[PDB]
Design a protein around this ligand. Structure first.
Ligand SMILES: *Cc1c(COP(=O)(O)O)cnc(C)c1O
Ligand SMILES: *Cc1c(COP(=O)(O)O)cnc(C)c1O
Ligand SMILES: N=C(N)NCCCCN
Ligand SMILES: N=C(N)NCCCCN
Lengths: 630, 629
């Protein structure tokens, strides 16, 4: 049954209604706001294959970016209406989360459909500013500038203001103020200034600009005061328009958001008190994504929802302004991750497995030692008539017996054959223990968890973790991962997913299912005869940019898919992934020379009939996708 | 003033390739003869004169050459001490660093040791093609690991067809049938190895299936299935190599010795079943001492080079003596140890946040008591204050400051009050740090906290995520040192921050004379003068794991040979990415954008200004992604 499978995965806890399992047992995406047509992801794959693109593939749904833009804006609007807050919310997209022109254009495109009709982007570095200015060349835009600012970064930012953008240069180091004033004078521009504030409510040391605590940016209380003082002196206090703080990405605890906003709102009111007219209050990033579906205060989740995040921000800022009797600023959030995580799915195939097949326990030959007979006797006592206690005993004896076998092999007591026999016999006992024990028995359940790991299939997935999913390796980030098809049989097996790199770390340690994080995943059985497709979801934020070429596996193919009015699958942009030859160039091999040398060597050492064949396979290997063929 | 050399103790991790000379400069000494030390700042000046700015990755192929000879000599010495009756063969696994310039130089050694062999290991389909391309000129030993499809298998067998010795190591049971089929198809006799799963390295590793994450290798039972199938095909002679790999950076020599013991027993058991295994490949694992402490920790190891080699050779030897069997050729795949030292990442410190001593102002008459108490702490803090009173001033001040932050947060204090409190505290810390004594057992740990409280932040012009990825990913420690003016390294303490917009772009730990610290002693930063830092031991796995966070790309890289008379020879130069390179990677049409700027400026900017501005936008696009001082 599919509907019992649906409760085993509980996709809806993490998918936000963008993905689900349909009645044919296929995973779909539903990316349109009218929710009009669902599309089976496997059917998108079938259509890529027709066009000669093989998996792995990264698939983007812009229609999902559009909805996130509207949801985040809707959430703050609701909060504004409920509080009767007397100013606006502005969404601003930090490009660091995902810089791809096709992501950023779709984000810009919905922002234009919004009532403010207000474009907002944030750059965190010189190269990002130039990218941001390129991508907002068409219309006047809010641009917030963060990061380390040299002369050239400041002059480019002022050039942007000259050319008609609203460019906020956020002061993050005290020396930058003096640089901005000089460069603005030199370009004849009226600069717009924001200030980044250091907070004392988020940990020891962060209030301090100097010192060995690692928050890089932001001005001290003292430094903030110096800014106001320097501006008053130059008759430029009106250029300070923006107050900024950034708590960090993926804030799991709503309390920290509240404490942060509380402290910042007070700074904002104190600055107006000293005469500055701050128009904007920018709460930075930090709006988390619920990667594991558990809504918990854990590093892969959050204990709050979208609207509640909005309310904590609006209410706190509003309450602090009412106390000071100050007017309320435009609220900005830089919510990159929330905007981008859901829109992308990585698809690839399971190209082989290592699974345990139950074989027959052969009886001990006269040659076998007591220890191995003991295991044989355990195997005979294991059946439907073995009681609940005695099954546990047999588990414990069998583990101890295998451990002793391993020690005797290591010291020269036992032959390779003895070891083999004991290992296969143990696996047979484990396999049966796993069938005889009951999940309704309280003392069997912990063992059945143990046994579930011990008997899981290894699934080798045609992809590189280091390339497509770097946070998995680097910070034990969890992503939901699921078979795309045949989900009626998801109770068949348990499996762990490994990548095809020659590295221990290219394996997933954690899975998302119906009750949260597990160490293995329930899956349909694999067959050599049918394609078996898997999906990594919530890969939309920070994954693409951060991946690297371990083992010379390169970029995957990527495509943009829009679902049309009548349910068409419009494949709108297509980016081809790396070939082996690309990777060879990247590491400075002269490939044209390699090809030509190959012509010689083959004519030298190969029989004439074969030569064309051998040369074709060499040339073809160079020109192939880095990834493997089933 | 050579307490400086002793503060850093560079030789504890440098292996004699880097040190400080008597002019206060970091030098490299890359030749085996150690004939000429070249100051690393002179390499930078020489690059500056060719229009390349830091950040720069500098690589020294003569260090690679020495690494190959040191590892071979270590094994050869162990072989001679034991009287081990067979040879050692070093095989380089290109996964550690795939650059042609690195691999060439390793290969260029291979040629020169009178046994005149060394090999390459590939661990995936595309590495196999890179290895085949890199050994095109000469016949070679090639070991193939990783997940093998039909194409990988056929390429490997073609490699053998063209004269290489290609060992296709079986890592999965199903891959034996595939090899045998395809070898028949290409009419080639295969050479096979087998990777074996060990039970001595932790629970679950012995098993092929199951949830434990050791990807590759055959279980004892599958090893026997291999023997049985090859006996039936009459192809048992094709199995020539036994393989295992424990993992990289093995810190505990005990694990090495346990792994070798177990695997030697597999080797001798296989011979017992008529297999004629000739090669015994112990994989990687041979660690690098990143912090110079030679301790059993994630960044270091409890053993040395010769010791590693003795543990291998003596263990294989003793077990063989036990079966009365012949000893095999020993192979190690020691990538990391071959490559870590040869490369240095150099960049400049382009700004700082430092605390500058300011006088503490008397509280205004409107100030609350709490801020008066802090004032009173400050007055009681001078050369007359006794040792115990210094600690109590330290504790009152921290308590005061904390209470100030709670009062700001609930509306009790103004920003001006907070500002005054924070600056007074810093002044009190700065003076505590001068009045307390290193000779006093109870000041020392306060001075430890003060060192951090008072450290300079140095902003280095590079991206940790691009150039030192393991530092972010696995808290890899790398030595980091300033390159110049080292006579002055007692000036201050600093932490190094990269210029990315990201909290994680900082180094948490530093290597000084004591091993690992949380700050580094350094010369003072001056705006007027260049300040260069080196990150060392970046040779293995850094270059290829780096990513484009915040759109910072590749740095320049160059290859430097020191000639017989000391000439600095800059033999290859790879240019780093420009802003335009990055924009194009994220699919912006840069040439269209160039054009639209011309449109936009001429329509929006006063005529007398247009050329200036357009020249600035274009110098923006064509410039290195990194910043200018
Ligand atoms: C990185 C960053 C962001 C993004 O935050 P997310 O929560 O990941 O979306 C926003 N603002 C600033 C200043 C950042 O550096
Ligand atoms: C990664 C790897 C190596 C390299 O080991 P290092 O200790 O990092 O030098 C050697 N052999 C194999 C099979 C590997 O996968
Ligand atoms: N994804 C990065 N590697 N780290 C995220 C940091 C962003 C601000 N805390
Ligand atoms: N530093 C790399 N990411 N990991 C290397 C692991 C390789 C075999 N243990």
């Amino acid at each position: 049954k599919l509907d019992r499978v649906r409760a085993d995965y509980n996709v809806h806890y993490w998918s936000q209604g963008f993905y689900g399992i349909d009645d044919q047992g296929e995973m779909y995406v539903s990316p349109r706001s009218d929710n009009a047509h669902q599309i089976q992801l496997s059917k998108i794959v079938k259509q890529l294959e027709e066009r000669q693109l093989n998996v792995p593939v990264l698939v983007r749904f812009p229609q999902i970016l559009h909805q996130r833009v509207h949801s985040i804006c809707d959430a703050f609007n609701q909060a504004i209406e409920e509080y009767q807050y007397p100013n606006k919310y502005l969404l601003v997209y930090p490009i660091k989360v995902n810089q791809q022109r096709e992501v950023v254009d779709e984000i810009l495109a919905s922002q234009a459909q919004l009532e403010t009709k207000q474009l907002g982007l944030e750059a965190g570095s010189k190269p990002e500013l130039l990218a941001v200015l390129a991508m907002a060349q068409h219309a006047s835009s809010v641009i917030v500038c963060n990061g380390y600012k040299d002369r050239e970064y400041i002059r480019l930012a002022l050039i942007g203001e000259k050319l008609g953008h609203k460019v906020f240069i956020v002061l993050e180091k005290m020396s930058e103020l003096d640089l901005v004033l000089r460069e603005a004078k030199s370009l004849g521009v009226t600069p717009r200034l924001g200030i980044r504030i250091r907070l004392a409510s988020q940990g020891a040391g962060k209030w301090q600009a100097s010192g060995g605590e690692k928050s890089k940016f932001g001005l001290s209380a003292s430094q903030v005061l110096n800014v106001i003082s320097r501006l008053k002196k130059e008759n430029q206090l009106d250029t300070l328009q923006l107050v900024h703080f950034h708590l960090g990405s993926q804030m799991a605890n709503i309390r920290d958001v509240r404490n942060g906003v509380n402290e910042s709102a007070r700074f904002y009111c104190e600055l107006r008190t000293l005469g500055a007219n701050i128009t904007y209050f920018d709460v930075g990033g930090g709006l988390a994504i619920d990667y594991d579906g558990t809504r918990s205060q854990s590093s892969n989740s959050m204990n709050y929802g979208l609207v509640e995040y909005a309310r904590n921000i609006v209410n706190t800022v509003g309450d602090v302004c009412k106390d000071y009797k100050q007017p309320m600023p435009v609220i900005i959030s830089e919510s990159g991750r929330s905007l981008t995580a859901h829109h992308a799915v990585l698809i690839s195939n399971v190209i082989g497995t290592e699974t345990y097949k139950p074989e027959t326990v052969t009886e001990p030959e006269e040659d076998f030692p007591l220890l191995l007979n003991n295991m044989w006797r355990s195997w005979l006592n294991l059946h439907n008539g073995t009681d609940a206690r005695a099954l546990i005993e047999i588990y414990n004896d069998t583990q101890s017996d295998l451990a002793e076998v391993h020690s005797q092999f290591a010291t020269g007591v036992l032959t390779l054959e003895h070891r083999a026999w004991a290992e296969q016999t143990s696996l047979r006992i484990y396999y049966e223990l796993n069938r005889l024990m009951s999940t309704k028995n309280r003392f069997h359940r912990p063992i059945l968890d143990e046994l579930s790991e011990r008997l899981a299939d290894k699934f080798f997935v045609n992809f590189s973790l280091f390339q497509s999913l770097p946070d998995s390796w680097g910070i034990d980030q969890v992503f939901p991962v699921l078979p795309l098809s045949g989900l009626q049989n998801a109770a068949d097996r348990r499996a762990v997913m490994l990548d095809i790199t020659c590295d221990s770390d290219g394996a997933i340690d954690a899975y998302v299912d119906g009750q949260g994080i597990e160490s293995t995943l329930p899956v349909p059985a694999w067959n050599e005869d049918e394609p078996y497709l898997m999906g990594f979801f919530l890969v939309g934020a920070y994954q693409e940019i951060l991946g690297d070429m371990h083992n010379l596996f390169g970029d995957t193919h990527s495509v943009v898919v829009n679902v049309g009015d009548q349910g068409e699958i419009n494949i709108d942009f297509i980016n081809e992934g790396d070939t082996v030859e690309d990777m060879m160039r990247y590491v400075h091999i002269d490939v044209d020379q390699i090809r030509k040398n190959y012509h010689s060597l083959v004519s030298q050492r190969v029989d004439q009939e074969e030569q064309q064949q051998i040369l074709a396979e060499l040339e073809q290997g160079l020109s192939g996708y880095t990834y493997l063929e089933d």
